[PDB]
Design a binder for this molecule. Structure first.
Ligand SMILES: CC(=O)N[C@@H]1[C@@H](O[C@@H]2O[C@@H](C)[C@@H](O)[C@@H](O)[C@@H]2O)[C@H](O[C@@H]2O[C@H](CO)[C@H](O)[C@H](O[C@]3(C(=O)O)C[C@H](O)[C@@H](NC(C)=O)[C@H]([C@H](O)[C@H](O)CO)O3)[C@H]2O)[C@@H](CO)O[C@@H]1O
Ligand SMILES: CC(=O)N[C@@H]1[C@@H](O[C@@H]2O[C@@H](C)[C@@H](O)[C@@H](O)[C@@H]2O)[C@H](O[C@@H]2O[C@H](CO)[C@H](O)[C@H](O)[C@H]2O)[C@@H](CO)O[C@@H]1O
Ligand SMILES: CC(=O)N[C@@H]1[C@@H](O[C@@H]2O[C@@H](C)[C@@H](O)[C@@H](O)[C@@H]2O)[C@H](O)[C@@H](CO)O[C@H]1O
Ligand code: FUC
Ligand code: FUC
Ligand code: FUL
Lengths: 89, 89, 89
């Protein structure tokens, strides 16, 4: 049908990350002030949400990717993506 | 085809809240630094969005729950979830 | 099944903006501490996400509107809504 997106941003440049769920895959587009590019995030999902927070100026991102009733948390903490501890139960 | 989520976070710990719409009901999973647990929020909806802000250490949360063309705003201001003033028109 | 919403907020009032995709159109409801009102944003879309950031006391808003596989970014920078440079991967 139509794709589904989620977005987050931080600072004042700003940095923006836009996640798109399309045909069962979530990909990431990124803005850091100098043109859009494709990010490192690539995981399966039919639905995506995101949140982020700063510690000082350092960004932490959590992406919630869902297929059917299964949601997986993906974590950015300054050195790549890792699977997080989030569960339903 | 999947559940639909929304997420918010605050502070540096951080705290995180993830809302999931599934089979016409929205439920809440919570992180305050010491493991995921099930939150108090439980209301009807097929779609959810969220935003939040701090007043000191006190979180204020607004959840927008949609069923058909009706969106209800649910408010956390320190003492349970209450309906907010939000309307379509 | 239901309308779909996206929300952002800023400052200490706070100000809130809620975008709703309904029947192929996205509209905007606004809170600046003094009651809900209808905003100027009105554009086509079946799905919506949003983020925002402050530069001094000035809000900047980015709304990601999707129709099929095409996502259009709409930009508020103090002087009306304009189309942004965002493109898909
Ligand atoms: C903090 C920041 O802005 N960092 C960006 C780089 O990353 C992007 O922003 C992150 C916050 C996050 O959203 C991420 O998904 C974004 O991609 C940004 O992109 C990197 O560019 C380099 C080249 O300049 C690489 O392409 C890198 O890709 C890989 C890598 O090859 O190293 C892919 C790999 O799969 C991935 N592995 C994992 C487990 O995550 C790694 C890993 O993320 C990084 O090595 C960790 O540092 O990345 C891109 O991630 C870059 C654009 O030049 O600018 C900032 O550095
Ligand atoms: C301010 C805060 O962090 N409070 C939590 C409690 O509420 C959760 O967080 C708030 C912000 C909101 O998301 C709620 O929906 C969450 O449940 C949290 O749960 C409360 O626990 C008591 C049991 O003593 C009652 O069941 C309430 O109904 C719950 O709201 C507790 C759990 O340890 O942690 C913090 O106090
Ligand atoms: C900065 C601001 O709040 N401007 C208000 C006007 O625009 C509204 O808010 C901006 C950020 C954007 O969301 C617009 O689409 C939205 O209409 C608003 O029209 C006016 C009406 O009272 O009040 C301004 O303060
Ligand atoms: C903030 C926390 O960061 C990591 O430890 C994750 O494993 C948790 O699920 C949570 O996101
Ligand atoms: C923050 C940036 O603002 C404008 O430059 C837009 O054209 C970009 O797409 C981006 O949103
Ligand atoms: C920030 C405001 O809080 C109030 O209590 C609510 O009634 C409004 O709708 C809005 O969410």
């Amino acid at each position: 049908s139509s794709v589904q997106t989620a977005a987050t941003s931080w600072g004042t440049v700003p940095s923006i990350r836009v996640y798109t769920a399309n045909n069962g895959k979530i990909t990431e587009r990124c803005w850091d002030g100098k043109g859009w590019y494709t990010g490192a995030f690539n995981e399966p999902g039919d639905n995506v949400s995101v949140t982020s927070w700063l510690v000082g100026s350092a960004i932490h991102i959590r992406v919630y990717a869902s297929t059917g009733t299964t949601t997986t948390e993906w974590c950015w903490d300054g050195n790549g993506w890792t699977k997080g501890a989030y569960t339903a139960t």
